[PDB]
Amino acid sequence: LTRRQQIAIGFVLVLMMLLTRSHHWASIHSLPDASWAIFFLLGVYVRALWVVPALIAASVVIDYVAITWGGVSDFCVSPAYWLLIPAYLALFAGGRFYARGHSLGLFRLAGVALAVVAVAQLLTTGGFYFYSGRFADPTLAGLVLRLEKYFPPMLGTFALYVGLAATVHVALAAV
């Protein structure tokens, strides 16, 4: 890939974040947050390590703007916010791990996705419940009710985007 193709890819990833990080799952009007799939897909495909911290930086300034200027609720922003970072890293590591084996991969992909997203969900949903300070008496039961509610739609968002990456790749492979 030329420098130009790299810049193009870079901008399309930042733009995707820009356009989707205000929706955790799909609505009639809007695309859901591509962020979790992106970090996973960076794990799968992109060797350069520096891209991950760069794309984290982008996510953070995007959230700040969305809320400061874009009129988006700041409900979700709290001391627990930084727990996004280990979730992003877990997803990236997930994609690295999936690429290591099977260097056919599909039923293996599903199992890897479910596990790696579950780690991200614990860190984020669990981080928020336990450390946002918006919950006076957080319990294990309470944690699990919330994982049960949020995991399916956020997993579906992830599978939407990773699904498409897969079908793009298999296509391009033929081509």
Ligand X SMILES: CCCCCCCCCO[C@@H]1O[C@H](CO)[C@@H](O)[C@H](O)[C@H]1O
Amino acid, single-letter form, for residue 136:
A
Q: Which is nearer to ligand X, 38 or 109 (CB)?
A: 38
Q: Which is nearer to ligand X, 66 or 85 (CB)?
A: 85
Residue position matching structure tokens 């874009």 = 70
Neighbouring residues of 128: CB distance < 8 A, sequence distance ≥ 6: 76, 78, 80, 83, 134
Half-sphere exposure of 31 (CA within 13 A, CB side): 13
Q: Which is nearer to ligand B12, 91 or 109 (CB)?
A: 91
Choose the contact partner of 96 out of ligand B12, ligand X, none; CB within 5 to 8 A by kind: none
Q: Where are the beta strands (DSSP E) in the chain?
A: none
Angle formed at CA 170 by CA 165 and CA 175, multiple of 5 degrees: 120
Question: Which listed residue (124, 157, 161, 162) binds ligand B12 by CB under 6 A?
Answer: 124
Choose the contact partner of 13 out of ligand B12, ligand X, none; CB within 5 to 8 A by kind: ligand X
Q: Which two tokens stand for residue 109?
A: 């992909």
- Residue 84 in the binding site for ligand B12 (CB under 6 A): yes
Binding site for ligand X (CB under 6 A): 1, 3, 6-7, 9-11, 13-14, 38, 41-42, 45-48, 50-51, 54-55, 79-80, 82-83, 99, 122-123, 126-127, 130-131, 140-141, 144-145, 148, 169
